[PDB]
C-alpha cells in the first residue's frame, strides 16, 4: 500500500518534493601502494597491490600472487574494487 499518515487516507508527497525529484531525475584515483580487488576477469575478487600507474592509457597494473611471486600483471581501469 501507500505511505501516509493514516491507512484510511494515504497522503501525497508535497508541492516542491515532486519538483525536486523531477530535478534529480532530469539532472577514485588508483594510488600507488593501494590494495584493490579485480572487478572482472579471471583475477576478479583477489587480494592485489598496486605496483605502478598506467594513468594516461585508462588502464591499471596491480601486483598479484602467482607462482609464489608478486608478478607484474596489467588490467583495465574497470577492474578496480575500491
Amino acid at each position: 500500500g501507500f505511505i501516509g499518515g493514516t491507512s484510511d487516507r494515504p497522503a501525497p508527497i508535497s508541492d516542491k518534493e515532486v519538483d525536486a525529484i523531477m530535478n534529480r531525475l532530469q539532472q577514485t584515483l588508483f594510488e600507488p601502494g593501494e590494495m584493490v580487488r579485480v572487478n572482472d576477469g579471471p583475477f576478479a575478487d583477489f587480494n592485489g597491490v598496486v605496483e605502478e600507474v598506467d594513468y594516461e592509457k585508462s588502464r591499471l597494473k596491480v601486483s598479484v600472487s602467482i607462482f609464489g611471486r608478486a608478478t607484474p600483471v596489467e588490467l583495465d581501469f574497470s577492474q578496480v574494487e575500491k
Partner: peptide
Amino acid sequence: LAAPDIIVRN
C-alpha cells in the same frame, strides 16, 4: 540523498 519525508519516515 534527501528522500521525501514520507519515505524517510517509513
